[PDB]
Design a binder for these strands. Structure first.
Length: 167
RNA sequence: CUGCCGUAUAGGCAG
């Protein structure tokens, strides 16, 4: 398993902004840092996740190799967001751990539009750079399993087939 | 929210 490193980022509490909004901004920032990085070997997970209350939790975990993680952190992608963040230290993941894939999940009038011309899940609220439309990006943490499969990750850090250690 | 792939009105994706 080559993605044996991680970094924990904690949202600092803030009366002005609820955790969900803070996490969304954080996630959006990670997204732009990922498209700048250009690869598909960096994943995420939300270790404090509350499946029952469809809440992502106060924590974002970044998964990558020691080198991919290092490069990612060299970038000024957390510019103007640091004061809202608490940083764990880049570390080798514990072992053993189960593995799971964290994926974006998607599910009438739009389906009617395209046709003519022819989700109880936690989420982040994002912003399409060009259109300016705001959309909810629903995230699912899949069933735990013993080993990790080969696979990559979206530029949002979501599973494109790849798994991340869960702990 | 908007679009894409697909006969789909199944199932997949993109911001």
């Amino acid at each position: 398993f080559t993605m044996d490193h991680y970094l924990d980022i904690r949202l600092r509490p803030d009366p002005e902004f609820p955790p969900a909004q803070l996490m969304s901004v954080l996630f959006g920032k990670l997204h732009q840092a990922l498209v700048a990085q250009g690869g598909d070997r960096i994943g995420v997970s939300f270790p404090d996740l509350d499946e029952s209350r469809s809440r992502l939790g106060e924590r974002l975990r970044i998964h990558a190799s020691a080198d991919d993680l290092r490069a990612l952190l060299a970038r000024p992608w957390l510019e103007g967001l640091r004061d809202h963040l608490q940083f764990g230290e880049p570390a080798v993941v514990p072992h053993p751990t189960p593995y799971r894939q964290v994926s974006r999940v998607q599910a009438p009038e739009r389906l009617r539009r395209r046709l003519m011309r022819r989700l109880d899940l936690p989420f982040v609220t994002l912003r399409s750079q060009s259109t300016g439309q705001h959309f909810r990006l629903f995230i699912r943490h899949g069933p735990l399993q013993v080993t990790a499969e080969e696979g990559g990750f979206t530029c949002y850090g979501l599973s494109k087939g790849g798994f991340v250690p869960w702990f």
